[PDB]
């Protein structure tokens, strides 16, 4: 299975097991959901009846008053009372099997090929760290929303794509499943494809 380039008009060889396997939606879903869950901060709490500020004094005597029996002004039944099942800070992170993560990326990268969303180029850089230069290069290569993976994280290209919200620039080791789906197009350098293959196998 041979990928084709647009800038140089050449052929780049790739593994059939990495860029030419069927889309395992169920597997990709689990990894995407796991990634979103990994992004959660999980920083919150409410006060149980134990934590709400006030005395343990029984508001009124058990019997004789003619009112519902009360034990604590902190009862969750009461206004200003505890939350019955007060939240604690949680870790929402999920375990993703190494093989289930790699198999998910393989499924995603394979879809990007068939949907013609993966563009392969020999070299992708700009002259100086100027957003105007990259912006111009993207309205020449004919894409607005795009994810750029490059071999060495060139400082100029990184800075030049920082103020463009629809454009993101990363290395081959910094690819994530969500970013390979979220972005309309993915523009990978020749070196990147020779780093991704070796990382997935």
């Amino acid at each position: 299975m041979e990928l084709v380039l647009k800038d140089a008009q050449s052929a780049l060889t790739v593994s059939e097991t990495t860029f030419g396997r069927d889309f395992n939606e169920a597997l990709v879903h689990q990894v995407v959901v796991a990634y979103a869950a990994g992004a959660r901060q999980g920083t919150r709490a409410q006060k149980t009846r134990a934590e709400v500020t006030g005395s343990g004094k029984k508001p009124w005597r058990q019997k004789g008053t003619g009112r519902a029996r009360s034990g604590s002004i902190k009862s969750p039944i009461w206004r200003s009372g505890g939350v019955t099942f007060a939240a604690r800070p949680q870790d929402h992170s999920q375990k993703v099997n190494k093989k289930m993560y790699r198999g998910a990326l393989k499924s995603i990268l394979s879809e990007l090929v068939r949907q013609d969303r993966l563009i392969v180029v020999e070299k992708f850089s700009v002259e100086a760290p100027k957003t105007k230069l990259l912006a111009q290069k993207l309205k020449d290569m004919a894409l607005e929303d795009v994810l750029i993976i490059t071999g060495e994280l060139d400082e100029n290209l990184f800075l030049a794509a920082r103020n463009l919200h629809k454009v993101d620039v990363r290395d081959a080791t910094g690819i994530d499943p969500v970013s390979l789906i979220a972005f309309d197009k993915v523009v990978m350098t020749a070196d990147a494809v020779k780093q991704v293959e070796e990382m997935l196998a």
Binding site: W60, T65, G66
Partner: peptide, 19 residues
């Protein structure tokens, strides 16, 4: 809502004793 109930106050009559 309901106000805090009163402590015991004098009662006019004894509860009848049934035994």
């Amino acid at each position: 809502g309901k106000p805090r109930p009163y402590s015991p106050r004098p009662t006019s009559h004894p509860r009848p004793i049934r035994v």
